[PDB]
Amino acid sequence: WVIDPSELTFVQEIGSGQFGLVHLGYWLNKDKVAIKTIREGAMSEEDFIEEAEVMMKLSHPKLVQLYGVCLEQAPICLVFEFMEHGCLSDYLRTQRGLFAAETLLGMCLDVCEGMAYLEEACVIHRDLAARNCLVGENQVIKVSDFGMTRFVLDDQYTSSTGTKFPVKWASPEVFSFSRYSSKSDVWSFGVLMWEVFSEGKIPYENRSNSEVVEDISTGFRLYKPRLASTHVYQIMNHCWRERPEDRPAFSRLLRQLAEIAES
Numbered sequence: 001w002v003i004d005p006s007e008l009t010f011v012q013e014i015g016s017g018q019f020g021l022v023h024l025g026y027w028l029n030k031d032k033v034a035i036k037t038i039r040e041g042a043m044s045e046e047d048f049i050e051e052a053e054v055m056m057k058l059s060h061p062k063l064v065q066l067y068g069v070c071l072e073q074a075p076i077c078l079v080f081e082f083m084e085h086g087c088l089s090d091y092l093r094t095q096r097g098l099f100a101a102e103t104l105l106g107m108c109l110d111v112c113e114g115m116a117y118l119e120e121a122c123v124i125h126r127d128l129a130a131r132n133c134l135v136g137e138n139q140v141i142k143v144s145d146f147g148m149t150r151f152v153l154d155d156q157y158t159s160s161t162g163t164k165f166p167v168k169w170a171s172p173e174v175f176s177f178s179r180y181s182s183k184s185d186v187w188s189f190g191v192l193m194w195e196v197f198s199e200g201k202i203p204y205e206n207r208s209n210s211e212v213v214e215d216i217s218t219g220f221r222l223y224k225p226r227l228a229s230t231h232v233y234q235i236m237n238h239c240w241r242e243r244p245e246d247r248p249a250f251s252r253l254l255r256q257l258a259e260i261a262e263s
């Protein structure tokens with residue numbers, strides 16, 4: 001799963017990510033690619049390479065394909081399928097006011113299809129959010145970065161008590177005990193649905209991390225976005241049930257969301 005540096009060419013910079021630069025490039029005899037350079041010390045590289053044999057086999061039309069790793073010299077880089085329209089969060093904000101309700105539900109269905117595949121594969125995403133979803137040809141949405149937080153070395157991001165912890169997308173058992181499951185991914189998915197129907201608004205903007213924990217623990221939930229129907233908002237609330245056992249599985253959500261789309 002190792003890509004030799006002689007098999008990669010960098011064409012143009014497309015931006016800056018959490019761990020370094022992202023470039024548009026080519027992979028010899030394969031395809032056009034997105035290459036993410038990873039700063040030394042940002043991830044547990046040895047742990048990551050160890051799991052490639054099993055994880056690289058994961059493949060689905062609604063998942064961004066990781067093609068391989070270039071590790072001859074530091075900084076290392078990850079080579080991915082190129083997604084023409086970039087991150088979902090930015091795409092929603094740039095096109096705000098131009099979306100039909102059916103297009104927004106369709107985006108949620110694509111994410112749900114990818115997540116149902118990961119659920120069946122017994123793979124936990126751990127940080128599902130619009131910022132981790134990509135937009136491809138003909139507005140297809142694909143999920144990316146599943147399981148990556150298991151390798152991140154910044155304690156301020158990974159610890160539930162950390163200053164940069166993504167509390168806004170965390171279920172109560174995640175913010176309390178780092179208890180991850182496909183059911184904690186369902187909670188995150190409900191928040192992702194709110195980001196989609198609000199056209200890229202940031203959840204709980206008027207609250208600090210501790211205020212979010214206190215509000216959620218006392219039963220408060222995000223308000224219904226204007227573009228979300230009462231049936232769609234009911235599904236969002238099912239993702240936000242306090243007990244993980246009471247939340248629907250992704251296989252169940254996929255059937256329920258598909259029924260809403262058709263009718």
Ligand SMILES: NC(=O)Nc1cn(-c2cccc3ccccc23)nc1C(N)=O
Pocket residue numbers: 014015016017018022033034064080081082083084085086087134
């Ligand atoms: N056209 C694009 O902007 N594509 C892409 C943008 N990205 C990015 C994903 C996550 C964070 C990023 C930060 C900065 C620039 C690109 C990023 N990945 C792709 C991809 N895999 O094609």
Ligand SMILES: NC(=O)Nc1cn(-c2cccc3ccccc23)nc1C(N)=O
Pocket residue numbers: 048049051052053055056057058059063064065066067080143144145146147148
């Ligand atoms: N867009 C992505 O993040 N894709 C992917 C990420 N991963 C991985 C997730 C977690 C740990 C991994 C360890 C090694 C190689 C791939 C991994 N596998 C894929 C894949 N098979 O496409």
